[PDB]
Amino acid sequence: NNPLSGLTHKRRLSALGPGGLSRERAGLEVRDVHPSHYGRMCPIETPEGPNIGLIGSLSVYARVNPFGFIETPYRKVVDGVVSDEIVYLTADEEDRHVVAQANSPIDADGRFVEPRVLVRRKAGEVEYVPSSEVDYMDVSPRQMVSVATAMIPFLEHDDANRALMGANMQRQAVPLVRSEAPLVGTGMELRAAIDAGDVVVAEESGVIEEVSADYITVMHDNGTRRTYRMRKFARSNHGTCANQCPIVDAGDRVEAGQVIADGPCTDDGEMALGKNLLVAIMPWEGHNYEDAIILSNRLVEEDVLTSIHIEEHEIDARDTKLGAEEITRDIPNISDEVLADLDERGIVRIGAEVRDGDILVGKVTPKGETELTPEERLLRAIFGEKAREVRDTSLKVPHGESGKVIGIRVFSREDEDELPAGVNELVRVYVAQKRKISDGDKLAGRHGNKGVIGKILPVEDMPFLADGTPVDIILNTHGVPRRMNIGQILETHLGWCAHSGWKVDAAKGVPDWAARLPDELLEAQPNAIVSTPVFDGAQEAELQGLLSCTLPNRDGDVLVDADGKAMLFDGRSGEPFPYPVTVGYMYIMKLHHLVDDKIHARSTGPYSMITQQPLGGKAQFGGQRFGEMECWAMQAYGAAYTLQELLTIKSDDTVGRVKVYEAIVKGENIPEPGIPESFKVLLKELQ
């Protein structure tokens, strides 16, 4: 889906499979967090479905020894003194000592400030202990979390449930057309993007000899040249678009290991899973009611959440019993208008826009004369069309698909291409669609705050600030204090501080809140990037202080208050909203759950050959399953006729469904239901 998903995939640790255990053979004890998982397996990143606890993610600094156990690094404490000597310990080796927490107050020499410090002990015991007892200590605060989990800013302010959901939804992000790095970051995005392998890093230092959208040539110091080819508009597996773009220009000195080109979900070498959106936390006329999301149409006009998707369609011409299927433009009883987008071979041409139902590959298959309906043979006789012993089996566009044909691949047995035995030709057509954000598409943040798009108002309907800039997204306030994900609020505040910038009062010394902040943070330009490491980073005191010294806009006016709220104007009426509303910038990701794929409907269609019931799934053009509980609902209502209609003429009544269709097209009334074919099959099996 995105580079982070692939990295996380390559770092998965599952308990299922041969030699492990069965899913039916896994109690509530194999799945829950174990105290030995500290710094080895993440206690957050794990699915919430039936595979919960059975599938974890390796911790950041963890590694595997040749024996098979997972080692984690620790700083060796000699005599109550922290040393830079680092050693990897296994689980039982860790249990044979006691380790201090990463965020321990440490002297500049290495001695612990407090005699008693929070220390972990075997059998998962947490307690204070003298400073002369600490044997080792943690390397980094984020030592226990996974790569995806370490990418959640203010993770220490989110409960484990919504943190799990945020880490799991980061892997569902869709690569957008253009990518923006988040204003509020954690520092992990860079290494995640580089180690994922979907960017282009320079192997050896040198200068850029020639840069193009196709490739980048690097002239090394020794004299050799290395050329990296860009992967452009490649179907990235799950249908996403893996597209790499050069970053450097002509004649730029680049060091070894530096990113010279970044791919999907990447901005200057950092993971860009979403966009920075101006968010206001307020209910708005019920369109954001319980987890629904209101968006500004600007995100549609400016392609802020627009994504490219590519689908692969495939068909083959084989050898049949009465001849051989041939791919030809000549299709029986088709006008020259439907075949207008096809070349002389019967293949759709590159660049043609194809809706659903359009022909992609024109294939005809010879059908025998003894396989003809009496009505079909009469209809062939009353039209004089002889020599049409072939029927149409062309490759058409499925329901819900529409885009531009970007690539064609043809494999012919005639042209030495090795096809499976019995196949004469094979065609693959790649169709690309440019999907703008739509009502019902699922957006989400990094703190497990998910929701679908309930309304996309015009840019003037949006509650706009004092200077007229309308907000981009409206999030309901009710769905914030229940989930215990205050991070999204904090990320908002800091977010705005990153967008506007700040300047701490330097006169009369450094203020008491900014005493712990680095000197690089006392001044910030607008649109600055910051890092809030997990279990470290910004504290609420420094955030409250930053909100008080936010930089003014171009007119010299401060739009948000020290509380973090701002005065908004109702774009529909004009009257300003009675109370200030929290306004900031939040990083929103577009998840791979779009209505363009999830919408489905069926009048009639294919039926399973054995049970004579409608097919299942959207891809097979099937219908919905009226299950057992739904039948209980019908019976509770007393809707006898509706239930009988559902289970007979609308499902597996072989003669009833056709007569119902005829009665509808004739204007007649609905006939009487017959006997289900599945019951006949049941009797024939009992026999």
Binding site: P73, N103, V139, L190, V259, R516, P518, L521, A528, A538
Partner: peptide, 23 residues
């Protein structure tokens, strides 16, 4: 600054604890 080893954009960190071992 955060992650000043490959040549990345200068992301400024709210870090109070030093990183003894890199990822």
């Amino acid at each position: 600054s955060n992650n000043s080893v490959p040549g990345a954009p200068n992301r400024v960190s709210f870090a109070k604890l030093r990183e003894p071992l890199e990822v």
